[PDB]
Amino acid sequence: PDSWDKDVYPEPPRRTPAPAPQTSLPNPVTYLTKIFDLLVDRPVTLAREFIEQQHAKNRYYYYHREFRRVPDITECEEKDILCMFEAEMQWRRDYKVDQEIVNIIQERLKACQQREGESYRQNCAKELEQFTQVSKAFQDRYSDLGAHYSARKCLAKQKQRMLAERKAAKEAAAA
């Protein structure tokens, strides 16, 4: 359905085999499906279409909110409380967005596992690989901040990691 973007929530093209009966016995599932369509689905679609005609008579919109980009904690001076406040709010919003990115990737992984059946270990390699990278980046970014996290502590963690990387790169160059 046009509700969601198919590029961010993909699925295979849904190959469905045609019915190829071999026996002459009646199929009870077909009779029950016809009964369900005639007794259940049709009144549901009628009620839904009535609801949609009532909705179309009144149309209004709600807008996704756009937020400007503000300077981050790195550009703030030591005791400039207002820039620190704006940088921290922007950092918190980015943290929430990253959580939801990981959520989207996890939903892809779960849907792949359910869809592929007994061949999930092989047919979900791409989803597992995407989740591994996203999980590694999220863990590098926010792991171990603890309660009372902030943009300053995240910056200190990143600086410590870059110092470790620089020392490790200097160690390798001496060989």
Binding site: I73, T74, E75, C76, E77, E78, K79, D80, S143, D144, L145, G146, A147, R152, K153, L155, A156, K157, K159, Q160
Partner: protein, 122 residues
């Protein structure tokens, strides 16, 4: 030690120097003045209670005098307090101005250049 007891040019028992007239007077609806009036009203209620009179309606002239006296004293008390804090601020700013080598203006680094230790929570 007395910080301002002997400030130069201070009149011994004045309670309100002339320079204090340069400050905005407290508004008559000042929440501190309203609390002084509330204190006067409570004093009047307790006066009725101790004397064994109907607490809320015994003497309205006496209760009114309690409220009025508390508000009247509180107004001048607030004026003196505000003036004294203004004097403290004036002296502190003047002294910082006159001793630049004791309050040196420091160029401030940004958080991108400061190295804070990170302590993981785990």
């Amino acid at each position: 030690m007395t910080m301002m007891s002997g400030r130069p040019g201070r009149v011994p028992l004045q309670f309100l120097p002339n320079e204090a007239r340069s400050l905005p007077p407290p508004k008559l609806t000042d929440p501190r003045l309203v609390y002084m009036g509330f204190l006067g009203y409570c004093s009047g209620l307790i006066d009725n209670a101790i004397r064994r009179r109907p607490v809320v309606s015994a003497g309205l002239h006496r209760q009114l005098l309690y409220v009025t006296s508390f508000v009247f004293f509180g107004y001048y008390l607030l004026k003196r307090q505000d003036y004294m804090y203004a004097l403290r601020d004036h002296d502190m700013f003047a002294y910082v101005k006159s001793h630049p080598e004791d309050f040196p203006e420091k160029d401030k680094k940004t958080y991108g250049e400061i190295l804070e230790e990170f302590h993981p929570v785990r």
